[PDB]
Amino acid sequence: YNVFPRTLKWSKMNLTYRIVNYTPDMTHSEVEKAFKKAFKVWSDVTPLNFTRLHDGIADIMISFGIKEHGDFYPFDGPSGLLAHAFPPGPNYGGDAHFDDDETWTSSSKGYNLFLVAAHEFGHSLGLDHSKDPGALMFPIYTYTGKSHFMLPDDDVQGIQSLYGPG
Amino acid sequence: YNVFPRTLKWSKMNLTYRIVNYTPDMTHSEVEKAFKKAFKVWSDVTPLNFTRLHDGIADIMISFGIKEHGDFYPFDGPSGLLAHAFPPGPNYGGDAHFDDDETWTSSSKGYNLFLVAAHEFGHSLGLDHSKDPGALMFPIYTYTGKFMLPDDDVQGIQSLYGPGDED
Numbered sequence: 001y002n003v004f005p006r007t008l009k010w011s012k013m014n015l016t017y018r019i020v021n022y023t024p025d026m027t028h029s030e031v032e033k034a035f036k037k038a039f040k041v042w043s044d045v046t047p048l049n050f051t052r053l054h055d056g057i058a059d060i061m062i063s064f065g066i067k068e069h070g071d072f073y074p075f076d077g078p079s080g081l082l083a084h085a086f087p088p089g090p091n092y093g094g095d096a097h098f099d100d101d102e103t104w105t106s107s108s109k110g111y112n113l114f115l116v117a118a119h120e121f122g123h124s125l126g127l128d129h130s131k132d133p134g135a136l137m138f139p140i141y142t143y144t145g146k147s148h149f150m151l152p153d154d155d156v157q158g159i160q161s162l163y164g165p166g
Numbered sequence: 167y168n169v170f171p172r173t174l175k176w177s178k179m180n181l182t183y184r185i186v187n188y189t190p191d192m193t194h195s196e197v198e199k200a201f202k203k204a205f206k207v208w209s210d211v212t213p214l215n216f217t218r219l220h221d222g223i224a225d226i227m228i229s230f231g232i233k234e235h236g237d238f239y240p241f242d243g244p245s246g247l248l249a250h251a252f253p254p255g256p257n258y259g260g261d262a263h264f265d266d267d268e269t270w271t272s273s274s275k276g277y278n279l280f281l282v283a284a285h286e287f288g289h290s291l292g293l294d295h296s297k298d299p300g301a302l303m304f305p306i307y308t309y310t311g312k313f314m315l316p317d318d319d320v321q322g323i324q325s326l327y328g329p330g331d332e333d
């Protein structure tokens with residue numbers, strides 16, 4: 001017999017990403033900084049390293065789209081679903097899509113891209129939703145307004161259960 | 167926290183299904199009986215339970231269609247691909263599609279819906295094709311009209327969901 005094998009975790013520590021396209025709502029620089037800081041969330045507590053590619057295939061392909069955008073998990077216009085990401089593996093595995101019918105921001109007027117991205121990359125790296133209301137992996141958006149981010153312990157313990165500390 | 171499981175499987179044992187539309191070839195009652203029996207192939211050897219929903223959103227949406235029918239697995243007319251079903255997951259995951267350019271039957275003629283649906287629902291539950299020519303998950307159609315799930319499929323499905331009541 002055969003089952004559909006999943007990859008619990010990436011079998012390599014060095015991962016690439018590519019920003020395929022960009023939201024209208026933020027400058028290229030603000031989007032780049034939001035994603036780089038979202039990766040640093042997980043690279044700071046694990047041996048994972050993340051490198052940006054500008055062209056060609058990367059492990060984590062990042063894009064903005066609306067409605068039906070090429071994977072038959074369509075977005076739903078403003079609100080509701082904000083973004084989704086696929087667990088580790090080849091092709092669509094690791095990839096992260098953000099609903100460009102939301103308003104993305106570097107601050108608070110809209111959904112903070114960094115926070116949402118750091119959440120989605122937890123999925124890309126093999127975390128499902130937490131039931132802990134204080135977790136980054138909790139499936140509800142909250143914005144504290146604090147200038148500094150600290151990864152909650154629940155997410156630290158979940159990511160390290162896969163990859164260990166750095 | 168929660169990690170994703172090692173195999174694509176359902177994280178709940180109570181699943182729902184919806185017959186979204188029906189083939190011209192058979193009565194609604196014949197179709198319902200075929201799918202109900204096809205689900206019993208798998209519930210009989212696991213702790214899984216299946217409940218029919220008449221509308222709205224079920225875990226396993228079942229539909230009949232031809233050619234391009236809204237995914238990356240378009241059908242291809244008579245024979246060839248007979249049906250397909252997505253592995254467990256949200257949205258289209260679990261769903262089962264049957265090519266209505268085939269002739270579906272409740273007998274030995276054309277393709278027996280019960281048999282093909284029992285195969286497809288293996289996929290809906292997380293089994294891929296088997297290499298064993300004796301298996302239900304073998305990707306070549308064979309009619310039988312006696313039903314015992316072959317051992318390869320039993321071991322496959324129980325590796326994911328356990329045996330349920332060993333009865």
Ligand SMILES: O=C(NCc1ccncc1)c1ccc(Oc2ccc(C#C[C@]3(O)CN4CCC3CC4)cc2)cc1
Pocket residue numbers: 080081082083115116117119120133134135136137138139140141142143144152
């Ligand atoms: O799409 C989403 N939800 C709706 C949905 C509807 C249907 N299916 C799936 C999801 C969704 C929601 C939220 C998403 O990302 C996020 C999830 C959690 C947070 C958070 C948080 C904090 O509480 C705020 N501080 C203190 C502790 C943590 C971290 C910093 C931020 C974004 C990402 C996606």
Ligand SMILES: O=C(NCc1ccncc1)c1ccc(Oc2ccc(C#C[C@]3(O)CN4CCC3CC4)cc2)cc1
Pocket residue numbers: 246247248249281282283285286299300301302303304305306307308309310316
């Ligand atoms: O579409 C199909 N194959 C062609 C194809 C597949 C994938 N990509 C392209 C084409 C296809 C073929 C068969 C399908 O369902 C079936 C697969 C196997 C069987 C069987 C069988 C038996 O030997 C007969 N008895 C005794 C032992 C077992 C179980 C009961 C029945 C239906 C379902 C789909």
Ligand SMILES: [Ca+2]
Pocket residue numbers: 058059060061089090091092093094095
């Ligand atoms: Ca990928």
Ligand SMILES: [Ca+2]
Pocket residue numbers: 075076077078079080081082099101102
């Ligand atoms: Ca949305």
Ligand SMILES: [Ca+2]
Pocket residue numbers: 241242243244245246247248265267268
């Ligand atoms: Ca066909």
Ligand SMILES: [Ca+2]
Pocket residue numbers: 224225226227255256257258259260261
């Ligand atoms: Ca489904």
Ligand code: NA
Pocket residue numbers: 023024025099100101102103104
């Ligand atoms: Na937008």
Ligand code: NA
Pocket residue numbers: 250251252253289
């Ligand atoms: Na399949």
Ligand code: NA
Pocket residue numbers: 189190191265266267268269270
């Ligand atoms: Na038909």
Ligand SMILES: [Zn+2]
Pocket residue numbers: 069071073084097
């Ligand atoms: Zn998508």
Ligand SMILES: [Zn+2]
Pocket residue numbers: 119120123129139
């Ligand atoms: Zn999420």
Ligand SMILES: [Zn+2]
Pocket residue numbers: 235236237239240250263
């Ligand atoms: Zn289909």
Ligand SMILES: [Zn+2]
Pocket residue numbers: 285286289295303305
């Ligand atoms: Zn098959």
